[PDB]
Amino acid sequence: TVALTVPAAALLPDGALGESIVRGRRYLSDTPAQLPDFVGNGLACRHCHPGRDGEVGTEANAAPFVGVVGRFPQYSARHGRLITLEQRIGDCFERSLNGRALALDHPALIDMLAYMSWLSQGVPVGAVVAGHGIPTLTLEREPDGVHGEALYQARCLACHGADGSGTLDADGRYLFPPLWGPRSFNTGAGMNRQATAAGFIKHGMSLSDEEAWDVAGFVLTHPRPLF
Ligand code: HEC
Ligand code: HEC
Ligand SMILES: O=S([O-])[O-]
């Protein structure tokens, strides 16, 4: 693998590419407000792809976008064939954002691509960046949702709410995003899978493995939009 590096925003180029990169960051950080026709819930991309200093997708083990562009096109079992990064992003809109995919030449999609390409600067095409994806966490026993409920009340509820509905900020964006219910990710999302949610809870955002497994189980007992 190669190291995860974040380029300097002060070294962003003047001109069309630089402006596109800045717009892409905003689309990724503020998606429901910037792309209402395509987003069907309360989530922005940064809610599962966080980053420090205003950037999105820069955190190891929380599915960073650093180096993503050089890994596409790639096989998708879901599609049964190779897909492009544009198509992957469309799947995220449809599932994680309970919405509608952008056209593959939509200027907002191209701005998102430009941003991801900027984050990927210097990464060799084909190389895997250390900390890519969300590592799954799988235990050799059933997730105990009863224990999970107790853990949730003690460790998560203060942010994500008794009803999993999250906490809005003053500008109507989610400070702490919804974990279930109508404004959360739909059943088609990767985060709706036990081992992915457990891995995200464990590494993506301390908890023991057993605690992460059980609380993920509790979270996933709840209703959310059907895909
Ligand atoms: C509810 C959580 C969630 C939200 C919201 C979300 N994603 Fe994802 N995304 C994931 C998970 C989980 C993966 C799988 C990571 C892995 O491959 O290990 C993923 C993978 C990706 C990948 C592929 C990463 C790789 O290394 O191959 C891209 C690109 C991506 N997401 C873009 C987006 C964009 C753009 C948005 C906003 C439109 C978005 N995602 C919103 C959870 C989310
Ligand atoms: C200090 C407040 C805080 C606490 C406590 C917290 N979270 Fe989060 N959570 C966040 C924020 C903020 C995000 C958006 C991603 C980011 O910036 O880290 C997030 C993202 C998530 C996501 C992905 C986004 C979504 O809407 O589904 C899941 C799943 C999640 N948290 C589950 C939990 C669980 C389970 C616990 C308890 C073990 C927990 N969180 C404790 C603030 C919190
Ligand atoms: O593509 S993900 O959002 O399931």
Structure description:
Keywords: Heme, Iron, Metal-binding, Oxidoreductase, Periplasm, Repeat, Signal. Heme c 2 binds at residues 156, 159-160. This protein is mainly alpha-helical and 227 residues long. The chain folds into 2 domains: 1-132, Cytochrome Bc1 Complex, Chain D, domain 2 (Orthogonal Bundle), CATH 1.10.760; 133-227, Cytochrome c-like domain (Cytochrome Bc1 Complex, Chain D, domain 2, Orthogonal Bundle), CATH 1.10.760. Helices cover 34% and strands 5% of the residues. A two-stranded antiparallel sheet has the order 1-2. The chain has a two-stranded antiparallel sheet with strand order 3-4. Strand 3 and strand 4 form a beta hairpin. Helix 7 (194-204) packs across helix 8 (209-219). It is globular and about 55 Å long.
Sum up the structure in keywords.
binds heme C, two-stranded antiparallel ribbon, heme binding, monomer, Thiosulfate dehydrogenase, mainly alpha, 5% strand, Cytochrome Bc1 Complex, Chain D, domain 2, metal-binding, EC 1.8.2.2, 227 residues, Cytochrome_c-type_DH
Tally of DSSP β-strands? 4
Total helices: the number is: 8
Shape label: globular
- What CATH calls the topology of the largest domain is Cytochrome Bc1 Complex, Chain D, domain 2
Strands side by side in the biggest sheet: 1-2
Protein structure class = mainly alpha
Number of domains: 2
Q: Estimate the strand proportion.
A: under 5%
Full CATH superfamily name of the largest domain: Cytochrome c-like domain
Largest sheet: 2 strands, antiparallel
CATH architecture of the largest domain: Orthogonal Bundle
The helix-strand sequence is: HHEEHHHHEEHH
Using the CA coordinates, give the radius of gyration. Answer: 17 Å
Estimate percent helicity. Answer: 25-40%
CA-CA gap between termini:
35 Å
CATH class identity of the largest domain:
Mainly Alpha
Structure ligands: heme C, sulfite ion
GO molecular function, one term: metal ion binding
Catalytic activity: 2 thiosulfate + 2 Fe(III)-[cytochrome c] = tetrathionate + 2 Fe(II)-[cytochrome c] + 2 H(+)
Subunit structure: Monomer.
Function: Catalyzes the oxidation of 2 molecules of thiosulfate to tetrathionate.
